[PDB]
């Protein structure tokens, strides 16, 4: 039905393993990763990457969400860097098969007593201009968050807050920061500072195991691919490094000095997502799922329940793809936070919900502009056809093709209950 | 609520190995679910009164045995017509009324080697007072199962044949015995003089096993509560074989003297129902759960995929029940075989269907008697209404329950792929 | 099938198949129970022991014999019935029979004695023919008393103040025959030597549908403290008329020994049954097929998951042997023991090998039987001038006496355990032996 | 207190998602680092004072990388580590061995190289305990480094490095030839894709630890160390994760070699492997080592477990084994127990040759003999119970695994004891 071939590419020998250490025995370089890469990119903008043209490659390499980091620069040196982001994830438009949407990011330059002057101004600034996320520097108690949510101010409440973990006292109080805030960013370069060395691994791999326990985002970031601002190749250390933040839990990657000042911005984007490829395959999904199947406590959200049920049909039949519908990316972040094998494909009307689900690991936004249809059934149907239509487009989906698909029973938000089994025609 | 948690052994249920699970068992958590292992009794001059046959409708009898080892065409034709009259009597109250199916026992062929003629003679008789089920005397390969599917003709297609394993060569010839048949009856009786005594427990476990692997029915027969028959309270031995058929994997377990001859059928039918129920809640669903799903292979059927789907979605939010629409009753078989804690309510138009369901474990006949509404989804909604309504009367169901609802794209059989959340109001 | 591969060839492919070892192989308890075979015949000597109730059918000394013969390991005494008289007749019976075979020392096999008590009746604690009953234990050497319906922790202190101090080394299986005593468990357990189910009252007292729950859940923990554990009354009842059994009673036997118990035990079907004999054989039968059956595998890591760290060194030299035995095959485990209690610990995580436990306490060797898995053997010859080569002629008599029994061959492998020094509690060493 | 060090909360989870969620950067390592650190001599590392502080600072094996340098040149580097050794042979409580390992030119356009034919004699003639063969690609290579080591280098132990896609697809057979292998990652990343290497190095890493041979991870693991007195993030989490992935050594090339901070490199290798090697989820691993073990009938192996067993049922401070050849001390580390298998031998080879086992600690027994050999034995316990004791594996009151045979010569193993300190 499927064929010998499709059994020995991305690693289903070693998927099938009744053992971790069966499992890694019959992993394959020879098994080429088919999936399409779920761990999303991102790039920090800077001197090496600002240029529109420049950006346009960067998209077409992986990125997908565009660091601006509030250390350096002047407001007037940052607004034309979303500007002339904008004007390169716009030059796609037309043709839907190279549209993506691509989010931004303001890293801010932290504090000090309290949240600083300049943090203060630099989040108003993030407003004022439509950005979808904050990396908030520092972090080291929830009051913390709270602090930054506070001057996203009247207007945008809606921005997600990834709290930056870089010292001791932010390993420390990692709970009751990860409850306040929407995910976390390991941010190796200060923590590695902080705290000695040789621990930094320790606080990466509890950080992860937390973030994918509590269903949040979590971002690996510093020194990834260091050697590539000079070099065109990475040392065996950090392919090593980005290959198991992958195999660890990470939903995001980071590129700072590589993509930002660095002779191979470009090349670095390609290299992180060679890399992600292989290492998402390597994944060993059967006692993963089992983990997070059993970590996960009992739930009564119909969109929770809803879920679990779409990621155990998905890996039943090896489906292709997850088409949900999504206002606020909610149900494409609860498929997500057990990690299915399949990919899940969210079509939403929110441009910004559409640009923030690349905080989730394997959701592919799909921004849907079409005019509403008067029958709410009908308009469902066409956005679910929309999916599937992008889907083949993309080389996601190919007809005889198994999709699971997520929709709720009315419409608005926080109501997703239905999980329907379809056959790709 | 707290005393939620204390009922049907949920601390036992909570325990992360075996031994714990054992350990925690207590005789004072009450069970709560419906008893869902099906009771079979033997029609015979001590239950063949229509009056005595409803207080064993009451009592829990699902099937009817007729052992056509035992009276002639005329006697059989009198015993079919007493239980189809107890089981009418019930009818006036749809919500609350009780299917039960009709399996004629075979004589068997005796000292030779194939088809019987007075099996050919009695498996015509079957066929033409509509008996559900056929339970196959001393079947020892395939080709026996073909020679009665072949006796039952053209207008016994849809009838359920389960072989009978009762010697050495049936449990050697097993595997393709179990592929052409719908199910199984371990038949100790007979198997204990064929086979050393000692042995019979090992051939129940495994054929039970096997049975539950295969996703298709098993019956554990004879001897249950023999004491029963004189004496009205059954021996420890006898309690605890009872409690362990049901503990094995029985789908359903069988009365024979105990209602055919005995003084105490209606007592015997409430002794199986009361252990069924505690043996039931005693289940360590975990491993089961896991076991199942690991060993049940990838399938491309939506039917199957559904309904792995909808019982993992069972558990996560612990739904009070399952309700499915099914005309064949296969997508209430393909729910049933991962053994969910929920009750399976099987909504059926077919009356045959909703005999014949008795046979899967967990499954709870409901047979629908209104016409087809012009509106397919109305018609598909007021069947799932009824389902809700008749959960709610006989105790299934509470207002602010979760139920996961399994229907299907359009109508007639095989197409179902849709699970939905749904509370009860 | 890598894990097995070499034993494979160098044991044969027939080796495989006999004792349920496909079905031990399996990776789940569902593939373990669909490769159970009735093919694969039984090879291990029978470990769970057989308590007879004497009585008119098994009183003379020539049918206490051929129960000997069948499989009996404890002969039980029900002080209910009978005066001291009678059961002093009974045990100098059973006694006669048992010496009869002690002629050869490396083939003798020994038999406890348990005085089952009357019980409270109305009353609140130890009644007056109860405390006069276990006076006539010690005086004529009892060694277990079933406490019949123990409800809490003092129930089972009084027993033992009635035993006296002659009374010490006697064992008390607590009997729980209410709800009381199911529910307050967890304390009698902790006072008591081991439990027996004794479902004829049980039955009675709690509903007949919930016994099943209190028979698995008593067994489990009895399975995880460590302690014996007997399932008692109508396992095959119907075998006090009739030849065979039913179908529920052979259940009922083999499910006993799969639920963990140590002990199982026939009532009225030995004491007044037309078949004591017969039905003696067929509980040896159930036991011996339901034994092969056992998941090990996950019993095994299941114990090993459950079972505290331990600083006793009897303990983890326990656990280290056990592993040992079960990574070669080993044929049996041979223990040096005064108490038993080195046996004891290795019985409670369940080997496969039998544990073959040599020792000169006539008494130890009669209560070992309450453990399953555990062959006692009585050891006659007076110490040697040099200890270490007094415990090397206890391990070789080990080896001859496994050897005549068929549990030992030429090119097994056995694991020896003993200690550092002489007298009880110093057991510490672990051993690998190849039979020569 | 015990229970809040070396990882032990995530040590008792049940999940390895509870394991990671429960690991604490408050947690101290107390447990010795088990996996060793090779280190390549050069221009950097070659001085009898610098080899003494990196000696101190963890290395337990000394590389000589035969792709550069003369016989003369080697034989210097030899002479220098051996003087280094030796200036602690003063106190035997305490003396560490070091193994010599020669890494081989390779074959390059060519079977076995002319100039390989000649390193191997001279490392047979000069003593040496390992050779990292270069470039191995089939068994038939392994037979031929073999061969040319000849009848005087029948214990050099012959560790295969696996370099290109061939050696990858035919790893199995090689494996089976050679006592352990290498994961040579700077020509496998040029060989085979970079973004593969990962996979290669876990299937190879894994498949050593089901046979029980030694595994080494090499290559640009510190790599910014050859310049900077601090390692990148993503070099310390590769450390890290060869160390979790399962290798029995870890190396350094250029940062001990050529670079400018050869005893901090050493140092780095160190403190990291000690933090990994408490974050190993040892619930698991143990059960996952021990189904995928065949059932043995020899009593070496079948003491081994039962060893490793006992050894966690009482939270054993260590494991002393009395070994000839280092085989009993091999079978207990496959296990990978969390107790220091502290192996007490005769044979100065065997006590170098045991570093490429993880958790196998070497003392040389140099003390007078006894006339009765149960006498000799008992001394020979109480000699790794005073080294443990003076070196902090052991205090009064711990618990130890003793594993001993009942006849003397190689191959008799089979007696295990449990025995509590003083
Ligand atoms: O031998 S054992 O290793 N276990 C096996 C017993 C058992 C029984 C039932 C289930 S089920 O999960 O309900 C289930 C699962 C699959 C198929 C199925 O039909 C049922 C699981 C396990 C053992 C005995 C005693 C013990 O006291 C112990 O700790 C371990
Ligand atoms: O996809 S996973 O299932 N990878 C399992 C990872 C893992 C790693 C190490 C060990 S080991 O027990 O130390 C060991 C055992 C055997 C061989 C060995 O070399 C090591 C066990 C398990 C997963 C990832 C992230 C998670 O957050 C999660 O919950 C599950
Ligand atoms: O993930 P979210 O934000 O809860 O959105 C899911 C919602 O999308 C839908 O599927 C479609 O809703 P709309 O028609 O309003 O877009 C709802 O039925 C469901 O409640
Ligand atoms: O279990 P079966 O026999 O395949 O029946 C399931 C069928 O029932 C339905 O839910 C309802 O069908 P009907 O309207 O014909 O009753 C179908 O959509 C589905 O195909
Ligand atoms: O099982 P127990 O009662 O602790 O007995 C085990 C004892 O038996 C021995 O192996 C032999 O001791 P004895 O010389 O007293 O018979 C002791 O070394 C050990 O302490
Ligand atoms: O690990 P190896 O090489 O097999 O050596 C283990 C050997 O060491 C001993 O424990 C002590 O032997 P020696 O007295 O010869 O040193 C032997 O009994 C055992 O056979
Ligand atoms: O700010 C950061 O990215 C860091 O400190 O690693
Ligand atoms: O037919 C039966 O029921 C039997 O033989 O047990
Ligand atoms: O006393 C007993 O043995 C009983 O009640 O079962
Ligand atoms: O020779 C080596 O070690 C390499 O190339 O990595
Ligand atoms: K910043
Ligand atoms: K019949
Ligand atoms: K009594
Ligand atoms: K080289
Ligand atoms: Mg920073
Ligand atoms: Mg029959
Ligand atoms: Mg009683
Ligand atoms: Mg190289």
Redesign the interface.
């Known amino acids: 039905?499927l064929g010998t071939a499709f059994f020995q590419q991305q690693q289903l020998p070693a998927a099938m393993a009744?053992?971790?250490?069966?499992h890694?025995?019959?992993?394959?370089?020879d098994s080429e990763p088919v999936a399409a890469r779920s761990t999303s990119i991102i790039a920090t903008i800077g001197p090496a990457s600002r240029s529109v043209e420049r950006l346009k490659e960067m998209i077409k390499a992986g990125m997908n969400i565009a660091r601006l980091n509030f250390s350096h620069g002047s407001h007037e040196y940052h607004a034309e860097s979303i500007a002339n982001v904008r004007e390169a994830v716009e030059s796609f438009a037309g043709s839907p098969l190279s549209y993506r949407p691509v989010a931004i990011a303001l890293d801010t330059k932290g504090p000090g007593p309290g949240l600083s002057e300049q943090d203060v101004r630099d989040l108003r600034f993030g407003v004022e201009h439509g950005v979808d996320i904050v990396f908030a520097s520092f972090v080291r108690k929830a009051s913390d968050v709270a602090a930054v949510r506070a001057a996203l101010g009247p207007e945008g409440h809606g921005i997600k807050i990834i709290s930056k973990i870089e010292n001791?006292e932010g390993?420390?109080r990692f709970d009751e920061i990860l409850e306040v805030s929407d995910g976390i960013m390991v941010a190796?370069?200060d923590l590695?500072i902080e705290?000695?060395?040789?621990?930094?691994?320790?606080?990466?791999?509890?950080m992860?195991?937390?973030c994918?326990?509590a269903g949040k985002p979590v971002v690996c970031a510093?020194?990834?691919?260091?050697?590539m601002i000079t070099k065109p190749?990475?040392?065996?250390?950090?392919?090593?490094?980005?290959?198991?933040?992958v195999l660890?839990g990470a939903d995001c990657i980071m590129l700072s000095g590589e993509t930002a000042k660095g002779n191979f911005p470009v090349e670095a984007v390609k290299?992180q997502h060679?890399?992600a490829?292989?290492?998402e395959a390597?994944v060993y999904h059967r006692?993963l799922f089992?983990?997070?199947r059993?970590?996960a406590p009992?739930?009564?959200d119909?969109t929770?329940?809803?879920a679990?049920?779409?990621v155990?049909?998905a890996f039943?039949?090896?489906a292709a793809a997850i088409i949900v519908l999504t206002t606020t990316g909610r149900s494409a972040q609860l498929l997500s936070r057990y990690r299915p094998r399949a990919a899940v494909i969210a079509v939403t009307r929110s441009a910004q919900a559409a640009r923030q689900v690349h905080l989730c690991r394997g959701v592919f936004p799909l921004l849907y502009r079409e005019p509403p249809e008067a029958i709410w059934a009908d308009d469902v149907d066409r956005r679910v056809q929309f999916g599937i239509e992008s889907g083949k487009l993309r080389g996601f989906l190919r007809v005889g093709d198994?999709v699971?698909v997520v929709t709720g029973?009315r419409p608005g938000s926080g109501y997703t209950?239905?999980?329907?089994?379809?056959?790709i025609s």
Do not use: Y
């Open positions: 039905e009744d053992t971790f250490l069966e890694l025995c019959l992993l394959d370089i001791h390993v420390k190796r370069g590695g705290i000695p060395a040789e621990k930094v691994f320790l606080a990466q791999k509890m992860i195991g937390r994918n326990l510093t020194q990834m691919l260091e050697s190749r990475p040392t065996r250390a950090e392919t090593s490094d980005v290959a198991n933040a660890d290299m060679a890399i490829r292989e290492a390597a006692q089992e983990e997070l059993r970590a009992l739930s009564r119909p929770e329940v809803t679990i049920g779409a155990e049909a039943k039949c090896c198994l699971i029973w209950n239905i999980m329907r089994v379809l056959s």
